[PDB]
Every structure is written in C-alpha cells, then in structure tokens.
C-alpha cells in the first residue's frame, strides 16, 4: 500500500512503508510542489539518505512512476547548524535552478537580485531560503551591517546567509537571500519543509509573474531598519 504524505507547502513524501509503517527503503521519493520534480532513492523514516533527481512521469491508483534524470548528483538531509550552512555549498537545488536566476537588480543601488526564469501563476514556490541557524538575541544584539540576510524562521530561530556565503560563487545551494525588498512585492516568505535543508522558508509568488521578472518580497522591518529601507519607505509613502 503506497502512502503519500503532503506538506502544507505542496511538497510530499511517497512510497511503501515498512512493517513499522515508516518511509524506509531504496524506492522512496520526495516530490516538489510542481508534482513533477522529485528526489528518488534511499530514505529512512522519511529522512533522505540518498535521493537522486527524477521526474514523476505518472501515477496509477496512487502508485507513482519515476524515471531518473541524466546525472550523478545525489542529495541527502543536510540540516544547517549555527556554523555550517551546507555540506555542499555549491550544489544547487534542482527545483529552484529551473525557476530562478541571479542578476543585477533592476532596483537602483540594490546590488544583485533574484529573477524568474518562467511565467508562473499565483502561489508558486520559486526559491528556498536556507542558511545557518542562530538565535534572535545574537541577531538583535549586533550591527545592522551584519543583518542584511537575516530572516526569522520562528520564535526561536533566525536564518542567516553570512559572509562569504552571500556571494553566489561561494554558495548557491539556495538563493532566497538574493530577493530584494519592495513595498509592492510580488512574493512572500512562506514556511517550507525541505528534504535537504529541513524546516526553512521559501519564496512564494503572490500572483502571476512573468519570465525574467524580478522577484521581490516585503522585508517587514518594524515601522529599527537600515537606511536604504527608511529612504525607500519615505519615497513609498510619498508618490
């Protein structure tokens, strides 16, 4: 009896459970929100040990049919810690890689930005926001200069992409931290349960976005915020 466990974010775990009703085996898979891209392979109690990129070709009476994608890239549960962002910082996420890219932002003096590779509709997960996990106290007690990439995960954890991981050349496992701020954003940060990164946040569209449109999110700073933010705020309230 095949079992599908769907997360509120749209992703899911699928496969036959053992005598103990656990997602353990060599033919288990995590399926991304597009219900097409998947990581097929060895899992233990739902945890990814060795997942290979695959495509969910079809499903018959709940039984999925996957076919491996060309390549030798395998993925595994690799939750970050306060000092380790990833065991393989240069291994990108396959779902994210087909939906977004980094380029110079259209926003003046905003540095790099995150752009869509495809035209998609509302509520589409586009990118992942992984990073090291630190406390709110550590973040709030330091200079804003060090909090350019900090994003609260919950009441006890803050996700960060500190130097030198803020450079694509040093880290591309996830790219959510590259989305710039806007008071008229086309995306929002949302909770996401990732098979590789574990509990993190993702960037989800609020509406239709076009290919090559810059993805933006409202940083939501208390109206305690950077100067560029306060400047754009005034320029926003006005005009």
């Amino acid at each position: 009896g095949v079992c599908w466990i769907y997360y509120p974010d749209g992703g899911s775990l699928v496969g036959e459970v053992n005598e103990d009703g656990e997602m353990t085996g060599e033919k288990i898979a995590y399926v991304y929100p597009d219900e097409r891209t998947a990581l097929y392979g060895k899992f233990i109690d739902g945890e990814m040990i060795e997942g290979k990129l695959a495509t969910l070709m079809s499903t018959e009476e709940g039984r999925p049919h996957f076919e491996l994608m060309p390549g030798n890239s395998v993925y595994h549960f690799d939750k970050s810690t306060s000092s380790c962002i990833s065991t393989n910082a240069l291994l990108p996420d396959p779902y994210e890689s087909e939906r977004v890219y980094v380029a110079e932002s259209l926003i003046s003096s905003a540095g790099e930005g995150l752009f869509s590779k495809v035209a998609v509709g509302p509520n589409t997960v586009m990118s992942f926001y992984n990073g090291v996990r630190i406390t709110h106290q550590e973040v709030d007690s330091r200079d804003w200069a060090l909090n350019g990439n900090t994003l609260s995960l919950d009441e006890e954890t803050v996700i960060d992409v500190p130097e030198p991981y803020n450079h694509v050349s040093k880290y591309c496992a996830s790219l959510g931290h590259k989305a710039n701020h806007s008071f008229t954003p086309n995306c929002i940060y949302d909770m996401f349960v990732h098979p590789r990164f574990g509990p993190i946040k993702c960037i989800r569209t609020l509406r239709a976005v076009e290919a090559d449109e810059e993805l933006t999110v409202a940083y939501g700073y208390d109206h305690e915020a950077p100067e560029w933010y306060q400047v754009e705020l005034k320029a926003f309230q006005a005009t």
């Binding site: 709110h136 973040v139 709030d140 330091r142 909090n147 609260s152 803050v158 999110v217 700073y221 305690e224």
Partner: peptide
Amino acid sequence: KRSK
C-alpha cells in the same frame, strides 16, 4: 527585531 533585526531580521525580516
């Protein structure tokens, strides 16, 4: 307080 100092994070998105």
